[PDB]
Design a protein around this ligand. Structure first.
Ligand code: FAD
Ligand code: FAD
Lengths: 304, 305
């Protein structure tokens, strides 16, 4: 049970979508995830732009995704892929488990949360600093929090947290709102301060817990300190493509897997879709769509 | 009563709806124009089981959910048909069958229309047994004999869905082998639904008032046979809804589909497209939603700089 027609790496929106179509296309399919299934979708506080769901908590939506995919593929949680190399008869997937064999592969490993790189970030990790609001937002009920990064992720994180924390403050590097207008309105509606043009210089605390965050205005230099209890960091993503070393699948300057209009990688038989691919739009809807494409594109070629 | 919007989306189908939600959340005033009532081809899908999140759901049901979702973000003008798109200084002029609409940007999501067989009796029997939508007219032949021309995914699921209330169903595929995904192939065999292959329909026959049967010539032996059916459903292809684009400047491929880049941009600045209308599309709700999402986000991205 380590041999399948198609092996998909990553149990997230893209992967799940690819699975259902791979199966329905008549292929035996296996989805391998280095952790429990769900992907970043499970960490989404509230999803309102996935067609068909007016408003659904990410973890809940991820549950529906997985259960849907479950009816067509074997979901192997806890299996991390470390390499992929083609062989005359498919490919070999070296894992933290054993070794899997597939004729075709679809890489849907998404991304990881980027780090800020400032004094006190490493030190206070698990001491008031977090990269997942849905995971640790509860810790700060009735408390003060600062969200570093005002993009769509940071915006909804803070918007959702403001429901139960004492107060939320958003600190954005760019001299403008980086989150979609729907969040801009919601943020202004809940009176959530959104500090733009601010560069965080330091996360500070009492050696035990976080007590505040230092940031300076990029233009005037004015440095300021704001006291909170929790600091959540949403300042970017990183493609999870490290396991593709010596695989032959081309990547762009930032680590993303380059693919053609039919989700094909530079390596015959290997397809990719989702937040992991180059130029992706970072949404569940596009991942689902592109995961669909990869699978049908896979089939299309399978029939010569 | 307004005709001016930051962005006009042409076509209220899966792609248009997704694009609408995204364009609206990005701050734009949005309007979705459809020549008929909203829903698009999704509403004619008997049973959708490959759109992530819904294990199984009747097409008409999913379309409603889509429309209700989109309505919260845009104005859906049913019964308005775009006849042309012309670029002006302020953006675009969109001539319809209900005055000219104006928009800064436009997204084309008009999908496709069903293709016609082109055989004798197809016209003269339309509405008298002939049809291109089983979800629409299938229930009429509940208990009678039927034949669906075309064994693609659409035709297949049409036959599979009807076999639940009809007498019998015979598919007639032009290509030699099965042309529908494996999931449908094993459903057909299970239900014992005949799947005549390498058959080329030559005529739809009836008694002048109602359809009685269809004649086809096996592309191999060259012969010609006949089958007893009350109703016939046609799913032999699709045509891009792009004729209204004549002289607009938007590049179409040799088959009429809009050609777009990786960011859903057509050849005309300010005009984007997504869904079954785009050349190379995979003809699924999922990818339609996905590209609709991209088009709107791409449109937003280009609006700033
Ligand atoms: C706070 C927040 C809010 C968001 N809100 C929205 C929203 O409202 N709307 C929206 O459309 N999107 C939203 N998103 C984004 C959305 O969640 C992502 O776009 C989507 O999850 C990407 O799907 P994916 O399948 O490409 O990858 P991911 O979901 O990132 O999944 C990749 C999977 O592969 C696994 N994996 C990685 N490397 C390996 C390996 N080497 N071997 C095996 N398995 C591996 C991972 O463990 C993971 O489960 C939000 C994200 C965040 C963080
Ligand atoms: C029987 C059948 C079963 C199917 N089953 C599945 C399935 O299980 N899974 C799946 O993923 N897909 C399925 N599909 C396909 C799916 O329905 C389509 O891929 C999807 O609807 C395409 O979306 P779209 O937005 O591109 O266009 P459409 O939904 O086709 O919508 C285009 C819209 O634009 C309008 N329009 C056209 N021209 C104009 C104009 N000039 N002015 C104004 N409005 C205009 C139309 O009236 C229409 O409402 C099925 C299709 C059929 C026929």
């Amino acid at each position: 049970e380590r041999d399948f027609d198609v092996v998909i790496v990553g149990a997230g929106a893209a992967g799940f979508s690819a699975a259902v179509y791979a199966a329905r296309s008549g292929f035996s399919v296996a989805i391998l995830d280095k952790a429990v299934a769900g992907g970043l979708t499970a960490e989404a506080p509230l999803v309102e732009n996935y067609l068909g769901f007016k408003s659904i908590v990410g973890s809940e939506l991820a549950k529906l995704f997985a259960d849907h995919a479950a009816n067509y593929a074997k979901i192997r949680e806890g299996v991390e892929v470390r390499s992929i190399k083609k062989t005359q008869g498919g490919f070999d997937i070296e894992t933290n488990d054993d070794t899997y064999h597939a004729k075709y592969v679809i890489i849907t490993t998404g991304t990881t949360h980027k780090h800020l790189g400032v004094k006190g970030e490493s030190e206070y990790f698990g001491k008031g600093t977090s990269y997942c609001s849905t995971c640790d937002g509860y810790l700060f009920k009735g408390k003060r929090v600062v969200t570093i990064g005002g993009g769509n992720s940071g915006a909804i994180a803070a918007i959702s947290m403001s429901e139960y924390v004492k107060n939320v403050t958003i600190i954005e590097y760019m001299p403008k709102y980086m989150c979609e207008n729907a969040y801009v309105q919601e943020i202004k509606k809940r009176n959530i301060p959104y500090i733009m043009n601010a560069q965080v210089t330091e996360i500070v605390g009492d050696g035990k817990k976080v007590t505040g965050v230092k940031y300076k205005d990029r233009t005037t230099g004015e440095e300021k300190l704001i006291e909170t209890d929790g600091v959540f960091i949403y300042v970017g993503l990183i493609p999870q493509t490290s396991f593709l070393k010596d695989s032959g699948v081309k990547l762009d300057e930032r680590g993303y897997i380059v693919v053609d209009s039919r989700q094909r990688t530079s390596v015959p038989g290997v397809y990719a879709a989702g937040d992991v691919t180059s130029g992706n739009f970072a949404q569940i809807a596009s991942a689902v769509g592109d995961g669909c494409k990869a699978a049908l594109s896979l089939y299309s070629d399978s029939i010569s």
